[PDB]
Amino acid sequence: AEDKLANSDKLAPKLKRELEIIAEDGRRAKNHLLEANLRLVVSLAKRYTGRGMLFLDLIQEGNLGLIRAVEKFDYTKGYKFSTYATWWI
DNA sequence: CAAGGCACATGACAACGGTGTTCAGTGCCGCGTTGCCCGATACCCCCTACCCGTAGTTGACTGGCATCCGGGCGCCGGGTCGCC
């Protein structure tokens, strides 16, 4: 939807708003996924705590890795998101 | 006995002696004042070796940490909920 909106060719206004709405719903689902995986990322932050970096800082950096991973994740892989994410985390 | 005539020496007279200056010229023989000559030195090039940053890696793997009491001591000062 956002790809089609990004193109310069003219689209109908109602169709453009529908595409924007679908992209917004995708954004909402993205944040749903991130909040779901917050627990995994804090677990992996535990896994590297106590090495001179504050635990919440490690959590935040892992969260950066998490947003990267979701930005690079899709169902085309026949695996759960948990297995794929942990590498990027 | 006085006056006039000859010896030696004498007031100056220059010119040599010997030696000290003079402006004069030209060198004599030590410092320099500069053209080379090289020699080294900064400064472009090419090559590759290695430091450092970026980007993947798919069974599954979904909430942690150990705190903290034997100050001690008092006050300020505010909050905080009972009180009637």
Side-chain-side CA neighbours of residue A27 (13 Å): 8
Nucleotide lying nearest to A56, CA to C1' measure: B64
Q: At what angle do helices A55-71 and A81-88 cross, to 10 degrees?
A: 120
Q: How was this structure determined?
A: cryo-EM
DSSP A12: -
d(CA A61, CA A71): 15
Distance A77 CA to B30 C1' (A): 102
- The residues, ordered by sequence, that sit 6+ positions from A55 with a Cβ below 8 Å of its Cβ are A45, A46, A49
Using left for φ > 0, alpha for ψ between -120 and 50, and beta otherwise, residue A50 falls in left
Taking Cα atoms as reference points, which of A72, A70, A78 lies closest to residue A35? A70
Task: Report resolution (Å) to 1 decimal.
Answer: 3.8
Is A42 in contact with A61 (CB distance < 8 Å)? Answer: no
Strand B atom within 7 Å of A32 CB: no
Taking Cα atoms as reference points, which of A36, A47, A21 lies closest to residue A70? A36
Is A44 in contact with A89 (CB distance < 8 Å)? Answer: yes
